[PDB]
Amino acid sequence: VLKWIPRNLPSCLINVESSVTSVKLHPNLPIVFVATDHGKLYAFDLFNYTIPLASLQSHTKAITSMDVLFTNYTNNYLVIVTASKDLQIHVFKWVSEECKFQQIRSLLGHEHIVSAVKIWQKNNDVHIASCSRDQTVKIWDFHNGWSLKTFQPHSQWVRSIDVLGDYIISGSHDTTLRLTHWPSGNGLSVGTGHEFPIEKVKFIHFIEDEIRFRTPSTDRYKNWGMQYCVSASRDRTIKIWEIPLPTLAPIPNPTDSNFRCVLTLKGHLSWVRDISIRGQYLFSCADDKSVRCWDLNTGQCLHVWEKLHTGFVNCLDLDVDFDSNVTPRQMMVTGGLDCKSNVFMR
């Protein structure tokens, strides 16, 4: 159930009006949501891909990123939020009674194009992350609708973010990584080693199922909850970084203020666009119309999807396995610049 590898040929293909920038998987029902460079937002059920379910033009510009979340409470619906180049982040509501999109509201506060959003639930309260081209990470509240904290983690505009509890990692256009603790809003460590802008960075969440990089080393790393980070850039390389232990509002150690590249996965023919972690395998795509599958233990590519798209492969994702609220089903969908999307079944 964990060592599943997708087949060499997709079973169903999704056709979209323009370039597909982001795709997301519904944790519960077999339906995939598809973004569009033209500005539309689609949703296709996994079994009848001939026609969509709902599609509206909410953003006046190209969607840059989106994500999904199934809320839970101790006292319960899918929340989808979409960023774009239209200087506004739109929050929607997915009602399964009618399977129709319902807009909740729109968010403002950025001075340039926003490129990444992350949503997480903490104690019956959810927050939406956001990084934009104005060099600020303005993460916002879904309930109140106002801002919470604004900070500048890089000298150049931030291209991707990821949230693991109270910690956020940021990858920017200045070929550096910076880890900042959000509630205090202070930088903790700086990660250098790339020479081309970062495309996507995310945490390596701990798993309990023996993957080398998904397990804590010592007791302190297990207590902190995180040890390793994975990042991709325009270097045609994927690098595995490690978080040095801070002095613990954590205090950045002067002698432990730098990262360390534990591994450097290479073999792509162009810029690595998006990455995903499933068990011991790392799934990545690039502009070479190819998708790799990097084993974490061996640090070597296992399966290559030659010419999956006729153009660039913008995005892909898997099901999250580090969270018990979402069952890690064997679904993977890849978005392409050739106005097409491929979904692999079982």
């Binding site: 340039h112 194009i113 502009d287």
Partner: protein, 975 residues
């Protein structure tokens, strides 16, 4: 070891020259090394001095403008001033050898003397010199002088005084024989092919092929053809290094792959500098002959050889289509990220991108782009630097700039390259060299990998402090002055790439730039030149395939094969592309451009103007024809309904007979208007983008040429075509005439050209400065008058950009090069906010901001950057304007009441005609939107009233005709 420049292959001549050079130097005598460029004087000197722990080499490269101060500045970091005054070397055990390259280049004054030559003869004969500020005599103790030069018969060289060469021992270094060169480069090819052992038996034939190719290139392409056709063994070693790099960073090779790779390297080394297509074909045939003679494989053209590491992890030959698609997507991303420019990616664009990438991927690899303006030199350089991760540094050299600003920019770039390890691409335009001191600074920067004049005294000491701190940061263990500055030089050489943009290579400044010694022998000369007709066909097709063009019957005309430059004619699109290419060629032929490169800016501007104008015309024609058709259908339906089965409706139907006749005539002539739409749009776009700087006779002759050329390719046009009747509307005409335009048709055409230019900043040549007050009347109080000759102009322009005022800049012959991004329409978009960079800080474009440039001086100085990117309009008085002004003056001074009545009558008649036209348009709009009968009756009555007013007012024309006939002789004598 091919990369290392310190390797020397020991031959008989090499060891002989090296040991006699050492014997001469150990005898404490002056040495001058002479010979043709590329002989190996520097090579034999360095080989002799590497094996010695007794001497150090200080390299100074002389140019046309070298002073004693440059020689002393280059000696600052190597020599110490002691009072025992005496100028010892800093080292106590090693002597210092002052090596002076290109020593003939320091020019003479008006009395035939060289400052540097006399300084050096003072240094050798008297062993010292006089220190200028304190007037004291220093003594040279342990410094030797070695000179390198070319024979005085070489161009740019001057004879030296006999007092100089009396103290110097002269050795002549000649070109090695073909056998010796073959042996040298067969050793090099063995070293290269050690990486590919399966082809180790082909090292010798490759060496003979390369040497024969070099000899044939030297024989065929001589200085008498072009001044930059100087070949040397340096070309052969460049080709060898490129071959080694290409196999080193490439996949497993075959014999065909090796031969094609060697041919590609030969193309990039020997044939990049070729100007004419005849020499390109000669080199292609020469490569064919060399391969058949020495290596007994597909096509060996420049476009057929496309080796690139962009599409894969290794340097290899790639397909054209996938490379074009990859470059298209990458340039889309580049337009998104840095600057939005609507460019078309063509085959020669791809080849130039590949060779610029090849140059920028090297170490100590520079570029010298020579070609016409608006060819895609600096934008391609920035795109390639973005692809390679380099930082683009364009110096902000403007008017009122001196040596201090350029030295500051160069020092900042050098510090970023070395201390901050920022890999930098430095783009130096030919217009950024204000005087020859800038060129000397760049010569010093290129010849070495440092500028010793920029680091003197306390600046030198603080540079040492900064570099010591940075070296401690990296952890390298070095503390001596020599090793630290060698690390400085190595970092500068590794991280700095200089690209030169040259538009007119026949200018004296550009000729000195090309013929500069270090610029010639370090840069990779890439003669891009003007666009060949294939490139123009490709880009024209790629910008006219997205516009509705083919909507009428088209028969392919019978034309010669040599006169068709596109694919064989099948649609109107190919005929239009060929027509535009032919008119561009005829235009540049009739303006006696000669050997000056022909800029394609006119072609691209004409293409864009044609596309937008035909789109607008097609939309308007379709809408108008649909309106006429639905109006006729509604009238017919109403008539039929009335006939089948209310007096106001009957009267309205009866009164619409003339309107129905007009609609029927328009419907009948719709086919004729559709026949000649494309030709009219083409002629219009030629008017805006070509005829701005032409008088009426040149415009008429060129229109005749365009008309016969457009009829040649079976494209229809309006026989009675007129620019005013096609682009100038009545409302615009009245606005211009009440603003202050003259009644002259040439001025109306110029005003239509300047007003309908919404994509290029116009340029005005009005000696009378009438256009200034005309445009100030056009925009009223929101206009602003700036000038390039006034202080604080930059702040006023930035404030007007923020507010959105219409800006007119006088003194157009004094162009200020920091508004270049405004001139080139280089804007940065931040959502709904559009910003431009002026000076040193970004400023927000309001969107209502407009730019006009005015110049009242005919035959002034307009830089090629400004000249090629403006809609330059000439406002020069002609015979008709002089006659009109003479008649107006004589009628005002003879009978003022009659003149006032006549001009009031003309204004009333034209206003009534516009009212009638707008009333007909309103009648058509109201009829399309279907009380209403009463409104239509009122409109018809108003139209009848206007017609009666015109009929009554048209009874005073004979008096004006008689007055014109009376004063015509006065007007003709006045003109």
């Amino acid at each position: 070891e091919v990369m290392r420049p310190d390797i020397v292959i020991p031959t008989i001549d090499t060891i002989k020259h090296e040991k006699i050079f050492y014997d001469l130097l150990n005898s404490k005598r002056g040495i001058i090394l002479c010979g043709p460029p590329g002989s190996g004087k520097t090579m034999i000197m360095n080989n002799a001095l590497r094996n010695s722990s007794l001497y150090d080499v200080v390299g100074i490269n002389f140019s046309k403008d070298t002073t004693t101060e440059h020689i002393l500045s280059a000696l600052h970091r190597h020599t110490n001033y002691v009072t025992t005054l005496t100028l010892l070397p800093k080292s106590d055990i090693k002597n210092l050898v002052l090596f002076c390259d290109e020593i003939n280049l320091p020019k003479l004054d008006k009395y035939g003397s060289q400052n540097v030559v006399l300084f050096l003869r003072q240094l050798m004969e008297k062993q010292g010199f006089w220190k200028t500020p304190e007037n004291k005599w220093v003594t040279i103790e342990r410094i030797h002088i070695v000179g390198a030069c070319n024979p005085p018969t070489d161009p740019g060289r001057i004879p030296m005084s006999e007092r100089f060469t009396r103290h110097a021992a002269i050795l002549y270094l000649g070109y090695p024989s073909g056998k010796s060169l073959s042996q040298i480069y067969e050793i090099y090819y063995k070293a290269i092919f050690k990486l590919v052992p399966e082809f180790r038996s082909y090292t010798e034939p490759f060496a003979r092929a390369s040497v024969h190719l070099y000899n044939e290139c030297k024989a065929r392409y001589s200085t008498g053809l072009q001044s930059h056709y100087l070949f040397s063994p340096r070309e052969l070693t460049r080709l060898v290094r490129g071959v080694y790099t290409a196999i080193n960073t490439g996949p497993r090779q075959t014999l065909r792959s090796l031969i094609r790779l060697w041919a590609y390297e030969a193309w990039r080394i020997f044939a990049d500098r070729l100007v004419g297509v005849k020499e390109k074909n000669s080199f292609e045939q020469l490569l064919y002959e060399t391969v058949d003679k020495y290596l007994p494989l597909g096509n060996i053209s420049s476009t057929s050889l496309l080796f690139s590491g962009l599409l894969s992890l290794d340097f290899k030959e790639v397909n054209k289509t996938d490379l074009v698609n990859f470059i298209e997507e990458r340039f889309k991303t580049f337009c998104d990220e840095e600057l939005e420019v609507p460019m078309v990616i063509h085959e020669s664009m791809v080849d130039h991108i590949l060779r610029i990438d090849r140059a920028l991927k090297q170490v100590q690899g520079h570029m010298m782009l020579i070609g016409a303006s608006r060819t895609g030199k600096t934008i391609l350089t920035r795109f390639v630097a973005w692809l390679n991760g380099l930082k683009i540094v364009q110096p902000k050299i403007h008017r009122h700039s001196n040596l201090s600003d350029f030295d500051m920019i160069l020092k900042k770039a050098i510090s970023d390259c070395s201390l901050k390890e920022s890999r930098t691409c430095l783009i130096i335009d030919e217009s950024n060299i204000l005087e020859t001191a800038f060129l000397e600074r760049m010569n010093t920067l290129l010849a070495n990998a440092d500028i010793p004049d920029l680091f003197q005294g306390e600046e030198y000491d603080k540079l040492l402090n900064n570099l010591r701190n940075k070296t401690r940061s990296l952890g390298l263990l070095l503390d001596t002055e020599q090793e630290l500055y060698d690390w400085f030089v190595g970092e500068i050489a590794k991280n700095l790439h200089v690209v030169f943009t040259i538009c007119d290579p026949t200018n004296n400044k550009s000729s000195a730039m090309i013929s500069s010694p270090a610029l010639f022998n370090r840069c990779i000369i890439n003669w891009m030149g003007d666009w060949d007709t294939k490139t123009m066909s490709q880009v024209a097709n790629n910008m006219v395939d997205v516009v509705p063009m083919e909507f009428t019957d088209f028969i392919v005309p019978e034309v010669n094969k040599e006169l068709v430059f596109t694919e064989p004619i099948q649609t109107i699109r190919d005929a239009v592309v060929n027509i535009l290419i032919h008119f561009d060629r005829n235009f540049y032929q009739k303006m006696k451009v000669g050997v000056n490169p022909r800029s394609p800016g006119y072609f691209i501007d004409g293409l864009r103007a044609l596309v937008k104008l035909v789109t607008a015309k097609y939309q308007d024609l379709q809408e108008n024809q649909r309106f006429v058709n639905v109006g006729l259908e509604k009238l017919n339906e109403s008539v039929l309904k009335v006939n089948e089965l209310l007096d106001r409706s009957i009267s309205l139907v009866k009164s619409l007979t003339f309107e129905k006749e007009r609609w029927l005539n328009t419907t009948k002539q719709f086919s004729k208007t559709s026949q000649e739409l494309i030709g009219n749009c083409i002629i219009s776009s030629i008017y805006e983008t070509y005829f701005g700087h032409l008088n009426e006779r040149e415009r008429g002759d060129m229109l005749v040429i365009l008309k016969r050329l457009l009829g040649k390719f079976a494209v229809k046009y309006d026989v009675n075509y007129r620019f005013i009747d096609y682009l100038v509307t009545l409302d615009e005409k009245m606005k211009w005439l009440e603003c202050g335009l003259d009644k002259n048709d040439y001025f109306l055409e110029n005003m239509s050209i300047v007003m309908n230019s919404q994509d290029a900043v116009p340029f005005l040549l009005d000696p009378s400065s009438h256009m200034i007050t005309v445009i100030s009347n056009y925009y009223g109080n929101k206009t602003v008058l700036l000038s390039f000759l006034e202080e604080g102009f930059v702040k006023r322009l930035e404030n007007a950009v923020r507010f959105g005022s219409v800006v007119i800049i006088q003194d157009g012959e004094f162009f200020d090069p920091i508004i270049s991004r405004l001139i080139s329409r280089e804007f940065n978009h931040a959502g709904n906010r559009v910003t431009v960079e002026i000076g040193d800080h970004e400023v927000d474009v309001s969107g209502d901001f407009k730019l006009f440039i005015h110049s009242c001086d005919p035959s002034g100085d307009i830089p090629i950057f400004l000249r090629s990117r403006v809609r330059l309009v000439h406002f020069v008085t002609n015979k008709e304007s002089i006659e009109t002004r003479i008649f107006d003056i004589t009628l005002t001074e003879e009978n003022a009441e009659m003149q006032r009545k006549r001009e009031d009558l003309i204004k009333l008649n034209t206003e009534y005609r516009l009212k009638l036209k707008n009333l007909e348009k309103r009648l058509l709009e109201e009829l399309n939107n279907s009380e209403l009968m009463v409104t239509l009756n009122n409109l018809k009555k108003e139209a009848m009233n206007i017609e009666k007013k015109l009929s009554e007012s048209e009874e005073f024309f004979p008096q004006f005709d008689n007055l014109v006939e009376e004063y015509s002789i006065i007007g003709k004598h006045s003109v």
